[PDB]
Amino acid sequence: MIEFDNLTYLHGKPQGTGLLKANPEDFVVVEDLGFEPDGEGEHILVRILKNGCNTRFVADALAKFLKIHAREVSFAGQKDKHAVTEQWLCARVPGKEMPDLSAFQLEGCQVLEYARHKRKLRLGALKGNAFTLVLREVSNRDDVEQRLIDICVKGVPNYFGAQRFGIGGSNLQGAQRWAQRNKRSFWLSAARSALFNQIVAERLKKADVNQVVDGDALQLAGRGSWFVATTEELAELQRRVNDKELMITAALPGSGEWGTQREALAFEQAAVAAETELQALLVREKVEAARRAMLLYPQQLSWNWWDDVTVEIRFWLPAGSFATSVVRELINTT
């Protein structure tokens, strides 16, 4: 298996270093539901700024303040103390009164806004996240500037970041050992994600990383739907890919059809051909194969150098894409 650090670079490996997330204020994430609260219904959505604790800790304290059971507070995913997050929480409190959520106090947290909403927030349901990060001790400004320019144009690889593989690589290691419930889920997720990263690393070795081939699975920008390239539509499909209307995808292997056909499917199979044990694990466990865009086009990418060795970068990414995957193409952090 290709190691994370050896994953192919779109812009080539950076010619300089810096510091990411040196303090929580250098890494600010604003969650994006994709909608405004209904303004009615049995749930209270509450946007809380948090700095210095995890998502479960705040949700426990919100439960207690509302005098409801802990299970009645839900969110998108659990986020540690190492970044600043404006995170959405969701409390079931029947009726049509509004509790004074502005009087809820907890160290390092701020209640920002709240409103009723009809449906529960569930794990993984965000549209995306808007990031504000400060990269410090940047060794090569000229290199980072050019890379930012080139990212506007070409994007970055849409890799799963190191976080997906658990601390120390443990989730992938666990997958590899098992291929010979919370843990089960993390292991399967690591396995399929590692395979996706590998197929992208291989595809990036082609002369033209955005060349559409016959059988490719092309996804519409900004949603899940995808369809299969054919030879007679290729010049037209190529144009749409070049114009960032369509996204060439790579497999998340699993049971059923991976979704590519003909030459593209042969390529995806060959790219992970030695990984028969992880493939069989996923099939056995009925983890349906899926598609994921190969590239990532950070939205509203903006930046500002405060001096020759400090830059503040902003962008928005869809749910399931990583800020570290953008930063991997700017600076070396190992």
From Swiss-Prot:
The keyword Magnesium does not apply. Disulfide bonds: none annotated. One of its GO terms (molecular function) is tRNA pseudouridine(13) synthase activity. One of its GO terms (cellular component) is cytosol. The active site is at residues 31, 80. Keywords: Isomerase, tRNA processing. Residues 155-296 form the TRUD domain. GO terms for biological process: pseudouridine synthesis; tRNA pseudouridine synthesis. Substrate binds at residues 27, 129, 322. The keyword Nuclease does not apply. It comes from the Bacteria. Its EC number is 5.4.99.27. It holds the Pfam family TruD. InterPro entries: PsdUridine_synth_cat_dom_sf, PsdUridine_synth_TruD, PsdUridine_synth_TruD_CS, PsdUridine_synth_TruD_insert, TruD_catalytic, TruD_insert_sf, TruD_pseudoU_synthase. It is an enzyme of class 5 (isomerase). It catalyses: uridine(13) in tRNA = pseudouridine(13) in tRNA. NCBIfam families: PRK00984.1-4 (NF002155), tRNA_TruD_broad (TIGR00094). Responsible for synthesis of pseudouridine from uracil-13 in transfer RNAs. HAMAP family: TruD. Monomer. Belongs to the pseudouridine synthase TruD family. This is tRNA pseudouridine synthase D. The lineage of its organism: Bacteria, Pseudomonadati, Pseudomonadota, Gammaproteobacteria, Enterobacterales. The gene is truD.
